[PDB]
């Protein structure tokens, strides 16, 4: 029914990056694919991500978090990178597959 959705929303809150004002995609480890995707982000999305991240690092050093009002809500989290990232991986797998043939 709505079980998968209950779990996700639960994990989302348990994770807690939303308390730093970060988007799920803001928290991705920057391996190669992720690095390429980031280079493809439009300027505005890229600067917003940068501010969010800088802001989180500053909270982190201060040992504070954002006020509860400013926390990112599960349903308002914008998966801004997932689209690019999936494409980057699709391309990689194409080349990998092709270079084997």
């Amino acid at each position: 029914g709505r079980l998968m959705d209950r779990i996700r929303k639960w994990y989302y809150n348990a994770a807690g990056f939303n308390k730093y004002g970060l988007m799920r995609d803001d928290t991705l480890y920057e391996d190669d694919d992720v690095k390429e995707a980031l280079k493809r982000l439009p300027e505005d999305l890229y600067n917003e991500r940068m501010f969010r991240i800088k802001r989180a690092l500053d909270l982190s050093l201060k040992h504070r978090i954002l006020p509860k009002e400013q926390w990112v809500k599960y349903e308002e989290d914008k998966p801004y990178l997932e689209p690019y990232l999936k494409e980057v991986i699709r391309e990689r797998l194409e080349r990998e597959a092709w270079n084997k043939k």
Binding site: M50, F51, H63, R64
Partner: protein, 80 residues
């Protein structure tokens, strides 16, 4: 050269005061402690549990080991 080649950054303003214009340990009661408590609270149920379990297992095993050193009167009840 590691300062100047790090990240493309735009439109962020920051404001900071000299250390001599501000206090070293400000708002201990209004901000510090509350947060300390906040931090402790958010973690205790993640850290404490297994340590508590460790303690139990420890206590059991220590007491169980001593109990096995004691004698069981049921081995001498018919030794007349």
């Amino acid at each position: 050269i590691h300062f100047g080649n790090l990240a493309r950054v735009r439109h962020i303003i920051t404001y900071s005061l000299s250390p001599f214009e501000q206090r070293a340990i400000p708002n201990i009661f209004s901000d510090a402690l509350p947060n300390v408590w906040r931090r402790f609270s958010s973690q205790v149920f993640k850290v404490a549990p297994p340590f508590l379990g460790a303690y139990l297992l420890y206590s059991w095993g220590t007491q169980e080991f001593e109990r096995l050193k004691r004698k069981n009167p049921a081995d001498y009840e018919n030794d007349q």
